[PDB]
Nucleic acid binder design. Structure first.
Ligand code: ZN
Lengths: 113, 50, 86, 100
RNA sequence: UGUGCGGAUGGAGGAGGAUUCCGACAUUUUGAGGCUGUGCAUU
RNA sequence: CCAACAGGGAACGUGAGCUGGGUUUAGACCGUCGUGAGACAGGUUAGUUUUACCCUACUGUGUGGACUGUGCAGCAGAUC
RNA sequence: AAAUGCCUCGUCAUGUAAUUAGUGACGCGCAUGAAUGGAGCAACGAGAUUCCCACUGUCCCUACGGCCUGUCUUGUGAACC
RNA sequence: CUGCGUGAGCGGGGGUGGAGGGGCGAUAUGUGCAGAUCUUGGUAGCAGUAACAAGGAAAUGAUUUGCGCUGGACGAGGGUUCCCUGUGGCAGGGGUGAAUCGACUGUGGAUACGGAGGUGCAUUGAUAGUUGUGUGUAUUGCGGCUGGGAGGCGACUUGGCUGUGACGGAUGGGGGCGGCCCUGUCCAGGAUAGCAGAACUGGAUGUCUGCUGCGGAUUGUUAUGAUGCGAAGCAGCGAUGGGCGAGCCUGUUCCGAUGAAAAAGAGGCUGCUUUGUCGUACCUAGACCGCAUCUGGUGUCCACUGUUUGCCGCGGAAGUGUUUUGUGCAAGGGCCGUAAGGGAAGUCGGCAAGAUUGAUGUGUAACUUCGGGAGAAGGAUUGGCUCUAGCGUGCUAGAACUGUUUGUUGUGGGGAAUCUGACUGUUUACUAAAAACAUAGCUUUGUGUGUGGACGCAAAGUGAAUUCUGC
RNA sequence: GAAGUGUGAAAAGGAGGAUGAUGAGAAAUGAAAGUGAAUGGAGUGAAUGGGGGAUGUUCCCGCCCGUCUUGAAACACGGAC
RNA sequence: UCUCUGUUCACGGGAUUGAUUGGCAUUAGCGGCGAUGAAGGACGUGCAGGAGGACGAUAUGCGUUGUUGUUGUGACGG
């Protein structure tokens, strides 16, 4: 059989895994006799060799759970496992509050108030 | 490994072209029948020591 | 774990091939051959009674000393051309 | 054989082996070599910055024109403009106390 | 074991011109659906 | 509590049945003794439990109908 | 009567239905005792001990169920004695 | 097979075998075996037994479907195991290309420290920062032409020299290579009984650390601050779609510890010419070491996603590995699950198992070196859905409704006493982890000089503090 | 720091089997331990031995050798062939 | 059939008998290496070649001289 030489050359040309390749079962005499990289590229244009598709996991039921808790849906006392500081650090709420009220004072002074 | 000294490389080459059986035209002679080289080495069993 | 498990750590090599005698016994950190004693000008005293008969006069080729012995049976006549000068 | 990083040479993370990641125009991901980091020039007296001299390693530095390697005034390669004024005033005022 | 799918009538409230859309769950059709190695009959 | 809570033997029955608390080499503490290395049937604490697939014994099982007789072997109820 | 007390399961009190265990007190102490260190426990300990709550197949007294072995087949095929 | 001899032994007959073999006297001896846990070689019983293997399938198997989790690169070690052809594992013939990869050069040392020089795209059966090609950088030698000054109050601009190499730990703020997520638009892909405001997947597009002049008293940080030794401000110089951070920029802090050395400086615009030697195939564990296709050991780098404080656990991708005619389950084992009523009666001994467990309000004693003890102990709440409030827009607080009562589908058992060691640490590689050893503190002794000069250097004992240390 | 010498006078020839050829001869000789096939006899008693008789047995006698020891069949040691 | 024991043929193993270009001893002579680069080591050399032996880029051997017609060989020199 020539199966082992065709999956090693075709997997390098197409840059995929050896199991994602489909070899036409009804053209065993074209598949037996390739032997070069230039002949493997002709069978890829003639659809004697085809590349399967990957699984990409869907995010549809993960996007529904993210817009539900933007309304506050899965955040009660039974759903928290880190501490209050781990999931919203207190030093970073302090920085955000005094940079905003140091900015008002700078423009209340520039307007004469 | 890929890295090796020049003296290590030329002794590995000599050891390589030694590991060979008696040629066929010599075994076919009348007075050399039933002779095999018998000084053969296989890389898993016996080690060369550099 | 001083048995089987300690053997998996032994991948450093201390020696190399000696340029005087050809054994794997030239210690690189010591700068010294443990077989022949290189780089001392004299060769090392052998370590056993059998060691004396593994490397001596006659265990190699004797490329020059054989020739000289054939010349001393005939009185050391040399090349017939140069014999006029002598 | 999807999704690999291409890396050439040794892998130890020293000062002289820093790498970035880049996507090449054919879709590959490569761990590429970055020049060795060179520091800013300072004054040798007050430790202020001399922001105009180039930041290069010593061999590439020496291949530049003199306008890249110094400032145009005395001590221009090592000293600050503020420390040179005081050094001139101090030299002149000293000679006036010795001719008196 | 415990009242099936689908439909119909409701639902704390919210959204906004259509008298529309979103909504856990409720009542009804319905001791209802699913399952069985035991017994009887038949093919 | 009970009718009553007798005494003994079987390689001081029974570790290829178990367990390892006593005893228990190599670590350590205290008291007394010794110039010392060390000692004590004086006290204290920490300290590997190997192998049956052979012969015999014993338990079943196999060693070619149906209905029965009669020899041998086993043997059960006890107490309030 | 302590990791140091022979006599010794010392004597009295306390915890139990019942205490050669534990803790408190006593002291002519075979043979306690002051850098051979004495007295002393805040904090720390996979160190040694005794008791309480909680909890349970540890036990009264065992039952039923799962997977891999064993039981049965083919191949490869040792050892102790 | 047969005769003779008390015996040690000696004769004859028939097959086999295919070249030598004896009697008698004296003489020379490495001169006679059942044993020595005798030496070397061969062979039985045990026994077709113990042990190991039989991996999910589909008459076919380049096609369809089911399961497992290491996957990809550099060094040490190995050395042709790499590719093609023929053949039942061998046999025959091929394959490793360098100014810009490493070393041959520095330092009393080096394939990780110092150091003249690059990035894309394509290409073989097997090599590629090495072959080919688009563009760049350095270098060997040989030429041609050309300048020693102009500017700016200043910071500085220019063919216009004497600079660098060259240096520790912890931690905050700013800003981000690549990857991943949310979002507008445009072009495509795969599955579908029925329904779905029109889902799911891929690709393409969508400024100030500093310095100078004027000025002449205020000004700023997450934090410590800055300023008549010249603040702010104005004008310059120089430097450089939204959100989750690596190198980078800028601070603070810690030490009886303060964080190597040497090689390697010159430079304008142009034309020709040069670039030595050795390594380069293949394998992270069935290509290494452990006698082996051995559940052990072996330096460095990169690696997606749901849930979550968590790169853990509990589940998924990518890449990679894998078979297709043994049985169906006695007793007894190894690893586990559930149990009426009782609740340590078991046992040397609660050994083993069970039990507590995340987060947020509440409530916390004796003692104490005032720091601790402390998450002491003890009690309560927790899902889904639909809304309200705050500002910093993802977290925090509040309310109604709802179910076969129930929500952490993970994460400490606690308390009262005695003995002992102060504490974090260290130990009998392969039966002892400790009360042993170390330790700070405390005390004693010697010594006027070693490169070292008494707050030094060396030798002993005791073992934190507190209170003491008698004759 | 080992273990391993032999077809024949002549290659006149073989090397899965069978049928054959060459040669004086299928080819150095080929013991014991142990095994397979056929065929005769015996057995359900550990076996084996001596006397006396007989084509197996029937009566009598008979514990396993070597060694050290006052003393061995020894629950004394060495000994599968 | 199985266990023990006669007989005949076939296995298994390598003792025995007979050989031997090897070993061991005594005796007579000799005791002949190197800066004019030794002994020893590494790597190479055949049209078709691995081990051993032989040989050194004049490499599976060259020149002179003797004996040969041969797979040729002896003695000496390079
Ligand atoms: Zn040597």
């Amino acid at each position: 059989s020539n199966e082992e030489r065709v999956r090693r050359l075709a997997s390098d040309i197409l840059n995929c895994g050896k199991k994602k390749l489909w070899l036409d079962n009804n053209e065993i005499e074209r598949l037996n006799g390739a032997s070069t990289r230039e002949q493997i590229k002709q069978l890829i244009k003639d659809n004697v060799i085809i590349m399967k598709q990957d699984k990409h996991t869907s995010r549809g039921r993960c996007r529904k759970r993210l817009e539900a808790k933007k309304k506050g849906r899965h955040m009660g006392t039974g759903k928290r496992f880190g501490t209050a500081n781990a999931r919203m650090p207190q030093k970073k709420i302090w920085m955000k509050k005094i940079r905003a009220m140091r900015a008002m004072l700078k423009e209340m002074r520039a307007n004469g108030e | 490994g890929s890295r090796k000294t020049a003296l290590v490389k030329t002794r590995l080459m000599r050891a390589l072209k030694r590991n060979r059986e008696i040629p066929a035209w010599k075994r076919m002679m009348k007075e050399h029948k039933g002779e095999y080289n018998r000084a053969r080495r296989h890389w898993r069993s016996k080690k060369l020591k550099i | 774990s001083k048995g089987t498990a300690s053997f998996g750590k032994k991948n450093k090599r201390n020696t190399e091939m000696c340029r005087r005698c050809g054994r794997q016994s030239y210690h690189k950190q010591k700068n010294s051959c443990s077989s022949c004693g290189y780089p001392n000008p004299k060769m090392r005293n052998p370590g056993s009674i059998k060691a004396r008969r593994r490397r001596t006069i006659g265990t190699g080729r004797m490329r020059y000393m054989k020739r000289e012995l054939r010349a001393a049976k005939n009185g050391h006549k040399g090349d017939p051309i140069l014999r006029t000068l002598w | 054989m999807k999704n690999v990083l291409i890396h050439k040479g040794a892998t130890y993370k020293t000062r002289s082996n820093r790498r970035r990641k880049v996507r090449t125009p054919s879709g590959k991901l490569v761990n590429r070599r970055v020049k060795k980091h060179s520091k800013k020039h300072r004054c040798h007296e007050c430790n202020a910055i001399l922001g105009s001299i180039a930041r290069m390693r010593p061999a590439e530095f020496s291949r530049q024109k003199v306008s890249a390697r110094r400032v145009n005034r005395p001590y221009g390669a090592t000293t600050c403009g503020r420390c040179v004024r005081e050094k001139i005033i101090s030299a002149f005022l000293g000679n006036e106390e010795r001719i008196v």
